[PDB]
Structure formats: C-alpha cells, structure tokens
Amino acid sequence: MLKIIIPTTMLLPMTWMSKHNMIWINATVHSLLISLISLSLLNQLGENSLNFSLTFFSDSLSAPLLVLTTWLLPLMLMASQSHLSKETTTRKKLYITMLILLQLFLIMTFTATELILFYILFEATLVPTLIIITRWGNQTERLNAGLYFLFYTLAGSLPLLVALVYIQNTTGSLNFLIIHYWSHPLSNSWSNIFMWLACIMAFMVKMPLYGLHLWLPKAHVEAPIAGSMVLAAVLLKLGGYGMMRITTILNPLTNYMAYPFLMLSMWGMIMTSSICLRQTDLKSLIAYSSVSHMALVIVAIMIQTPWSFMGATALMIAHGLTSSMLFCLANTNYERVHSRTMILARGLQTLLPLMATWWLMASLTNLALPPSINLIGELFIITASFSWSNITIILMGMNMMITALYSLYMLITTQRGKYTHHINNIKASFTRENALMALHILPLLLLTLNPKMILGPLY
C-alpha cells in the first residue's frame, strides 16, 4: 500500500496550502489520479492474499472495496461543492481535509493485517463522519442523529475491543493470516457463546441489522451529501468486511447461534422494504432501502458457503455504488425545491429530460435486473439461502417482489406525473450533476462485463 496511503495522506497538506479557489480543482485532479493508482490492486494471485508489509495486506475482498472508496472520493467533492461554495475558505478547506482524512482511514482499515489495527481504524472512522453529520448538516434532528449514530456504533464496538484483546492473550497473535492457519474448533459453551456474541454484535450494528438500525434513518437523512454517501456506500460495507474476516475463528458455533440473526434479517427485510412502500422523505426512502439490501448481506454471511460469500461482496459493492447514486439524485431535487417531501416536486421528466433517464437507470439498478451487479449478487444469495433451507425462497423472493414496488415508486411519484404547478425555480441540470451521475453508473454497467474482479475472495 504505502503506494496509496502516502499519496492519500499527502493530499492533506496539498489541499490546505492550495490556491484560494483552486481547492476543488486540484483535489478532484489527484483524487481521481489516486483512484487510478488504486486500480493496480484489483489483481490478485492464485490463493495467497496480496501481502506488501507486516501491517498491510490485500486480498480478493479488500481490493474491490479499496478501489470503491478511492473512486468515491472525487464524487463527494463535486456533489458537495455546490452549497459549500458559499462559506469561508478555511471552512471549505476543512471539509476537504475531513473527506481526505475519512478516506485515509478507510483505505488503511480495509488492508489492515492485524485485527487490532483493523478495529482501531474501523472505529476511528466515526470521528470524521460524526463531525460531518453534525457541523455541516442542514436540519435540526442532525444533533440527535449524530448522537444516535455515534452511540450505536460505539456500544457494539466496545465489546469487540474486550473480545479482541482476549484472543490476543489466549490464542496469541491476531494477524488475519495466523488466525486463519491456526483456526481451532470454538466448542459450544456459555463463555464461547458470549465470545461469539461480542465478536459479532459490533459488526452487526454497523450493517445495520433489523432492530439495531434506527441510527441509519436519522444519520443518513440529516447528513450532508458528502457524508450521506459514505455512511451508506462504504462504511456500511466496513462492517461487512469485519464480519467476513472475524468469522474465520467463530466456527462451528456460528451455525448454532446464527438463528436469531437470520430470522431478524430474513423477516425484517420484508418489514424494512415495507417502510419504503409508504414513506415521505426521499432520503429516508433510499435509507430504508439500504437496510433491506444490507439485511440481505447479513443473512448471506452466516451460511458461510462459497456462493454466499461471492454474492455478499457482489451485492455489497453494487449496492454501495447504487445507494450512493440515489443520494445524489435526492440531493439535486433537495437543492432546487429546498424540501425533502416526495409529493412536493412531482413531475421532473417533463422539465428535466435526462434527469429522468439517470433516475431510470438508478431505480433500475436498485431493481436489480439481470445482468446488473445488484442482480448478480442477490441471485447468488438466493441460491445459497435456498440450499440452506427451501422455505427461505418465500421470504427471499418476497423482498424481490416488494423491492420492485418501492424502487419504481419514487420513479412514478417524482418523474412520471404532472409537474407541480406552484414550483417555478427548477433549473436545467448543471453539467456537474450529469457528469457526476455518469461517474456513478458507467463503472457499474462496465463492471457487468467482468464480475470476477468484484466476485470476492472465493472465485
């Protein structure tokens, strides 16, 4: 890494000492350039994980996330640079500082070789995000939302810290390699039961799982757009990366204990998508949509079968690029109308023709048509879940049927209808918005040709 981490860190003094107005220019230049460099890690060898140093290593699961995060960094810059152009230079510089720092932690977290090093930076992502949602938020509930997001993540992470150091004292080193090659049978016992619960709850809260998820509708909606992406597009998957790594030692206790989590995710995903069927805030619509997709990842991890892990990463990457897109979409309207109510701005295809097209493919990707990467992920989990139990196809498909109704629902309510009479401030979409949307959907459809890169560490 050093070859990505150092350029990422070096963006921090660059943006601070950059020219007065060239901050957005230069930061966008090299963040795209750094993403190009991170494309180098998309290659993985036969079976051994790509190892660079003792503290840093990559595999066929971290690298597809690493490129996603570094590719995201330009996107938050352009999306947020609309409203941020109306404050002090230091304030705008402080934001770009914070996204650069937030991305820096994500790159170092995903390639962490020691589980303790993983946990330190995994929880360290809270500080850049927490200040983003609170300081630069555009509502009043953000103050309560930031507390909800911070406390939920921390309340689960702290048992992990106690559990993690326990492995250090008992088993020895916690390197992701030495853990794998020295896996021992975690026998069923009450102490092992809470050992299992502690090492799992921390990542479950950040998924989020059905019930430990009320921070998401508050955090995501109130957060600024530069944040509203990352809290949905990368760091939810950060909890995912934690699960797929920590479950190396939690066998065979996982199958005996997974039942409450499976039923909560498998049944709650129907309820969560049912919220999306009747919602009032467009941001909340996508937010609860993310919960349903992540809930499908939650069940996917726990069968611990080759197909499930592949469909886990496939949906995990695809949803992040998708859910990031919809937040850009809701941002554009929210700037023009200065409200988030769905029915307020009905009719956009009449006034904005291409915005409807971008909305069409955006709502289509969430609809997960074949061969879109969303479908290639959900379909894999359905087959893996069906092999686990034949009944689950009733629940698994029900969401697939239900997710069609709401995913096309904002398409009908916002785009396909009579334009609202009283609104008169809609402007022709800036070429920044359309260019940003292309930056989201073009890699997604391009990724369809070669799913092997994102298929996970079991291809």
Binding site: L54, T55, E114, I116, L117, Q168
Partner: protein, 171 residues
C-alpha cells in the same frame, strides 16, 4: 515450640554479698581495679554467649572473688572504711565530692597495707583484652539456615526479538 530447659535451683546458691550500696560504691574503684580478672571474662561471657544460663560458672566466681576482696579490708583498715561508707550514704546522690577527706583516709590506708592504688580518671572506662578459654559460639543467636538467593541476572543484552511485540507495532 519446644523445651525451655534452665538450670536447677542447686547451682543458684552463691555466697551473695550482704553489703549495701554505699559500702559497694565506697570501694568501687579499688574493687574494680583488683577483681577485674573475674569481671572481664564473665561480662565477655554475657555478651558473647548472649544467654544468662551459659555463664552461671563465671557468675558465681565474680561474687566469690568479691568476698576475698571484701574480707581483705576487714583484716586491714576497715575502721576508716566504715567511717567512709557511713558518710557517703548521708548524701542522697551518693557523691564523692562531699567526702574527700574520708576518700583520702581510705586511700592512704589501702595504699600501704595492701597497695591497691587509686584508679586514675578514665582508667576503668577502658576496653580490655581479657584472656578466655571458651570458644566463641558458632551462632550466638542460634540462627537457622539461610534461604538461597534467587539466581543472579547475567548475560549480554540482546535486541528484543521482533521489536516491541505489542499488538501490531513492529521495530
């Protein structure tokens, strides 16, 4: 914890001196300078043996040697001795500065009839090389064995293997 065996009542019958303090202190210096041979090694026994029971043999000798000194005065200028020690008691401090004239009378008598000279100032307060026959005790405190000290740390320092070894930190 065991037996506290101590000498019987048989050996505790010495010819105890029947004099009082004034007559004891009236002579004092002459007695100290003429009966030092049984005093020194008995007191040395008291310090070296650290136990009263083991020095009973020397304990009786000093008392016995006192009698030989005491009755030697009786065959001699004991009448000046009586006038002396019967003048010392009258003072509450038993101090010699108020009985100098009788100090002379006792001294002049004992100077020629016996020859016991007056010990000069500081002469009694003197560490002496008393000859003795008993060997020194191997452990006067009867000390038991001593715990073996922990093995000594040694060996040239070597760099800490793989550095700090604390979590993921290296070097």
């Amino acid at each position: 914890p065991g037996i506290v065996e101590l000498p019987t009542l048989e050996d505790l019958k010495v010819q105890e001196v029947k004099v009082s303090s004034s007559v004891l202190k009236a002579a004092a210096h002459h007695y100290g300078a003429q009966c030092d041979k049984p005093n020194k090694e008995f007191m040395l026994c008291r310090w070296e043996e650290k136990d009263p029971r083991r020095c009973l043999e020397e304990g009786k000798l000093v008392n016995q040697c006192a009698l030989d000194f005491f009755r030697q005065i009786k065959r001699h200028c004991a009448e000046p001795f009586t006038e002396y020690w019967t003048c010392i008691d009258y003072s509450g401090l038993q101090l010699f500065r108020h009985c100098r004239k009788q100090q002379a009378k006792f001294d002049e008598c004992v100077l020629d009839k016996l020859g016991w000279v007056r010990p000069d100032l500081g002469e009694l307060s003197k560490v002496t090389k008393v000859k003795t026959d008993r060997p020194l005790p191997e452990n006067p405190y009867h000390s038991r064995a001593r715990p073996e000290p922990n093995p000594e740390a040694e060996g040239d320092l070597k760099p800490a293997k793989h550095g700090s070894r604390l979590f993921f930190w290296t070097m």
